[PDB]
Amino acid sequence: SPMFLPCVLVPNTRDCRPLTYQAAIPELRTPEELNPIIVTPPIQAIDQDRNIQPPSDRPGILYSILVGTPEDYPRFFHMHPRTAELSLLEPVNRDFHQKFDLVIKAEQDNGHPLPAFAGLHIEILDENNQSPYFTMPSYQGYILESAPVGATISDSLNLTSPLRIVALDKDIEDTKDPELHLFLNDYTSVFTVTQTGITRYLTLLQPVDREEQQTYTFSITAFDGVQESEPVIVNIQVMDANDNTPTFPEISYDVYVYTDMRPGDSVIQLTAVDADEGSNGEITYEILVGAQGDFIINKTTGLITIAPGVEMIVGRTYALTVQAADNAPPAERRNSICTVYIEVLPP
Ligand SMILES: [Ca+2]
Ligand SMILES: [Ca+2]
Ligand SMILES: [Ca+2]
Ligand SMILES: [Ca+2]
Ligand SMILES: [Ca+2]
Missing domain, CATH: 2.60.40.60 (Cadherins)
Structure with missing residues (x-):
């Protein structure tokens, strides 16, 4: 007899479309952080006649969860009888629970229950809750001092293959770009890192001069929009070119x-x-x-x-x-x- 709102008309009929209310819950977050659970649209049942006039206070409606799947839902959810407020009781681990489908009951409290029912679907959401990381504990690079701007740092004295910096993130599936931001803690006017891809490289922003500075040590930190990685330490060795001539004090x-x-x-x-x-x-x-x-x-x-x-x-x-x-x-x-x-x- 009570009807859940909204009543979405089924065209060519006089029927309300059966409602399936929607909620979503970030995995692993506490009741304190999350409560109350926002339901879309908000859960609400009203009475038809007599209440043609302003209801104001005292709807006289009792809400409850009639049934749900999986059956442990009572462990995680509680509904307030008068307000239909949904409260999380315990953090949800998505490894064990991906979703709940409940049935909501609305009945009158005057002693003549004429129950109404509606769906409530609850998604447990994956979250960006894993810190990114580098697949090596450190990085050793080599660059010839005669290298031009734009040159790529090498991973060996032979200067034949580029220094590969691989930053991953367990929130992102395999072979997919985690789209990380990489912070350099120093020498950002000397070196830059490529800004896309699972594998990153270091290139020269400025030419380097071994006779001026022969080694560079700094650290890189990855960032996924929520958490930082541990800084990973990098050393770059500038290799000598014969770019100085034996010079007498005078002619x-x-x-x-x-x-x-x-x-x-x-x-x-x-x-x-x-x-x-x-x-x-x-x-x-x-x-x-x-x-x-x-x-x-x-x-x-x-x-x-x-x-x-x-x-x-x-x-x-x-x-x-x-x-x-x-x-x-x-x-x-x-x-x-x-x-x-x-x-x-x-x-
Ligand atoms: Ca995750
Ligand atoms: Ca992440
Ligand atoms: Ca030089
Ligand atoms: Ca030199
Ligand atoms: Ca020389």
Whole structure:
């Protein structure tokens, strides 16, 4: 006799469409967090005649859950008899409960129950409740300092394959992009990470200079819109290019020697500078021409001395063209020239 609202007319008839009220419940959230459970549309039954006039208070209607499936619903739900307010009693685990289908009873309390019934369907919702994660505990990358902007960080010294950063999330099914946001905690003006895909890569925003900074250490944090991952730590090694030339302090050197000096005496100590790494910075000194057999230089020290079995003479002048070269492979080798002007003087 009472009718649930709304009465949706069945066209070409005078009948109300049977109602199935709808509710949805986020898995694992507490009654405190969720109550009261919002029902769409709101549950409500009214009386037909007499109540042609303003009902105001005291509807005289009692609500209850008549029956439901699965049968443990009483464990999770309670309905208030007068207000039909739906209360969750315990958090719901979707692994065990995906849905409930209940039957709602509405009857009068005057002693003459003429029950009415309606459906109530309750979905248990999956939620973004798993933190994203990286599939490696850390990441080691390599980049050649001569790499241009846009270059991809490599995962080995060979620089043959890109550094792969895989960020997953258990809320997202396999082989599907979890659409995570990745935060870098440092060097965001130097490196950037690709912004889509299950596998991410690191590329250069700015060129890097090994001679300026040879290593970068920072951490990446994934974010799914709700929870962050643990930060994962990253080290990037900048690899040396032979992009520095062995350099003398000056273009030419004026030096005087003396007649009483003999084989094995320091004439001048030349020192060139190469900031590159290892053999790329390893300098070799050579007199190309001009010594006339009277002077030699130490290949590794750069010290010029008197040649063996050689005696100075008073007026003699020399123009030594001295080369400093690094020990990179010939294809990448760099060098520069210093001219040493030597003049013999009396003591
Ligand atoms: Ca989930
Ligand atoms: Ca998630
Ligand atoms: Ca450099
Ligand atoms: Ca060099
Ligand atoms: Ca270099």
